[PDB]
Design an enzyme around this catalytic site. Structure first.
Site, mmCIF file in Angstrom:
data_model
loop_
_atom_site.group_PDB
_atom_site.id
_atom_site.type_symbol
_atom_site.label_atom_id
_atom_site.label_comp_id
_atom_site.label_asym_id
_atom_site.label_seq_id
_atom_site.Cartn_x
_atom_site.Cartn_y
_atom_site.Cartn_z
ATOM 1 N N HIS A 1 -12.163 8.798 7.505
ATOM 2 C CA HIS A 1 -13.021 7.682 7.020
ATOM 3 C C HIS A 1 -14.495 8.015 7.166
ATOM 4 C CE1 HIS A 1 -9.355 5.394 8.175
ATOM 5 N NE2 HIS A 1 -9.640 4.759 7.049
ATOM 6 N N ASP B 1 -10.154 9.940 14.402
ATOM 7 C CA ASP B 1 -9.942 9.399 13.039
ATOM 8 C C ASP B 1 -9.193 10.407 12.155
ATOM 9 O OD1 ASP B 1 -10.293 7.575 10.789
ATOM 10 O OD2 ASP B 1 -12.143 8.581 10.266
ATOM 11 N N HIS C 1 -3.803 3.750 -2.090
ATOM 12 C CA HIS C 1 -3.079 4.704 -1.214
ATOM 13 C C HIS C 1 -1.629 4.917 -1.679
ATOM 14 C CE1 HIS C 1 -5.957 5.739 1.817
ATOM 15 N NE2 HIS C 1 -6.136 4.504 2.242
ATOM 16 N N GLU D 1 -8.911 9.099 1.397
ATOM 17 C CA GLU D 1 -9.749 7.929 1.655
ATOM 18 C C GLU D 1 -10.789 7.695 0.556
ATOM 19 O OE1 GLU D 1 -10.325 5.289 3.677
ATOM 20 O OE2 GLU D 1 -8.212 5.736 3.977
ATOM 21 N N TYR E 1 -2.770 13.054 5.196
ATOM 22 C CA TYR E 1 -3.788 12.147 5.743
ATOM 23 C C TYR E 1 -4.438 12.729 6.981
ATOM 24 C CZ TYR E 1 -6.005 7.456 6.225
ATOM 25 O OH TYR E 1 -6.906 6.380 6.198
ATOM 26 N N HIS F 1 -8.180 -0.742 -2.518
ATOM 27 C CA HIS F 1 -8.177 0.487 -1.662
ATOM 28 C C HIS F 1 -6.758 0.719 -1.139
ATOM 29 C CE1 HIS F 1 -10.078 2.986 1.719
ATOM 30 N NE2 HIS F 1 -8.859 2.763 2.174
ATOM 31 N N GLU F 2 -6.131 -0.343 -0.617
ATOM 32 C CA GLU F 2 -4.788 -0.197 -0.065
ATOM 33 C C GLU F 2 -3.764 0.165 -1.117
ATOM 34 O OE1 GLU F 2 -4.984 0.267 2.935
ATOM 35 O OE2 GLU F 2 -6.726 -0.983 3.452
HETATM 36 ZN ZN LIG Z 1 -7.697 3.882 3.422
#
Ligand SMILES: [Zn+2]
Ligand SMILES: [Ca+2]
Ligand SMILES: [Ca+2]
Ligand SMILES: [Ca+2]
Ligand SMILES: [Ca+2]
Ligand SMILES: [Ca+2]
Ligand SMILES: [Ca+2]
Length: 316
Positions: A231, A226, A146, A166, A157, A142-143
């Site tokens: 998310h 958020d 990005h 996301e 974002y 996931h990271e």
């Molecule tokens: Zn993320």
């Protein structure tokens, strides 16, 4: 470090033994020379200065409790590199074999992980909500996804573009988890979330509502928390991706599934050729439809299924 490539052995966060690519020059460092222009893992030493120190070990054996998060960050970065290279013909996150850097032991009790624009960063968790976050292959992938998004579509974002950002990271994190093929599922973070509670996770792609996230555009969050729900509203897109792959009927709308490999091809093409920094959910639908058309033809099942999936989550 300038040295010679070596192979160390250690134990990850979940207690599993693995081999890791290291480099020797006086010490053995977590520097893998076998992939791209290297994968480098750093010790942040419970502080927030980054990247910290390149990880050094006297004997090339990584079995201490303190070593476990580094072993997994380093190993799972290699798996994710292999997925993008072998499946998508992409060399690292920039497509030109950029060095991949990660720091572990970030801060104290830090219940998160992130891409900071230049590297991946993993907290150890507080031992209640999380254990060290690099223990989750879906979290590592996931990271690193990005980074891929930042070099390609560059989805801002916040709000709908941020939710797509996301969702792309949850989708490819999951596809990397299936590529490695150890206990794969459509949940996010289950290996490192809440050690005292079995069966839960941070988010679900197959049933986002399970953990309180919307699975239909009509239930989208529109407040300011958020980053405008990046998310939270990712659940709407996560569900569409799940449906494209696996099929199902959702609010009465039936979707013929086309499998994970074609889901990955369609979304990778959308991300790298059609999406832009300001894309919203409607524009994502168009990008995925166009990608599926490019790959399989306007009359294909694949195109029909992309349309069905977006219809099912209320995205026109
Ligand atoms: Zn993320
Ligand atoms: Ca050692
Ligand atoms: Ca799993
Ligand atoms: Ca998972
Ligand atoms: Ca748990
Ligand atoms: Ca939740
Ligand atoms: Ca602008």
């Amino acid at each position: 470090i300038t040295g010679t490539s070596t192979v160390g052995v250690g134990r990850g966060v979940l207690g599993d033994q693995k081999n890791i690519n290291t480099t020797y020059s006086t010490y053995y460092y977590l520097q893998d020379n076998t992939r791209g222009d290297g994968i480098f893992t750093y010790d942040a030493k419970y502080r927030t200065t980054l990247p910290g120190s390149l990880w050094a070990d006297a004997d090339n054996q990584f079995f201490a409790s303190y070593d476990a998060p580094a072993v997994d960050a380093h190993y799972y970065a290699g798996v994710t590199y292999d997925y993008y290279k072998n499946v998508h013909n992409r060399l690292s996150y920039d497509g030109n074999n950029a060095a991949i850097r990660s720091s572990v032991h970030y801060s104290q009790g830090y219940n998160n992980a992130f891409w900071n624009g230049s590297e991946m960063v993993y907290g150890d968790g507080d031992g209640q909500t999380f254990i060290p976050l690099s223990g989750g292959i879906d979290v590592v992938a996931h990271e690193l996804t990005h980074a891929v998004t930042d070099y390609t579509a560059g989805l801002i974002y916040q709000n709908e573009s941020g939710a797509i950002n996301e969702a792309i990271s949850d989708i490819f994190g999951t596809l990397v988890e299936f590529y490695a093929n150890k206990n794969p599922d459509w949940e996010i973070g289950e290996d490192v979330y809440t050690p005292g509670i079995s069966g839960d996770s941070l988010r679900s792609m197959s049933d986002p509502a399970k953990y309180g996230d919307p699975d239909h555009y009509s239930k989208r969050y529109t407040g300011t928390q958020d980053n405008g729900g990046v998310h939270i509203n990712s659940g709407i897109i996560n569900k569409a991706a799940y449906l494209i792959s696996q099929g199902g009927t959702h609010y009465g709308v039936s979707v013929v599934g086309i499998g994970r490999d074609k889901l990955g091809k369609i979304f990778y093409r959308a991300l790298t050729q059609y999406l832009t920094p300001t894309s919203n959910f409607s524009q994502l639908r168009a990008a995925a439809v166009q990608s599926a058309t490019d790959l399989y033809g306007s009359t294909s099942q694949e195109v029909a299924s992309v349309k069905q999936a977006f219809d099912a989550v209320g995205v026109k």
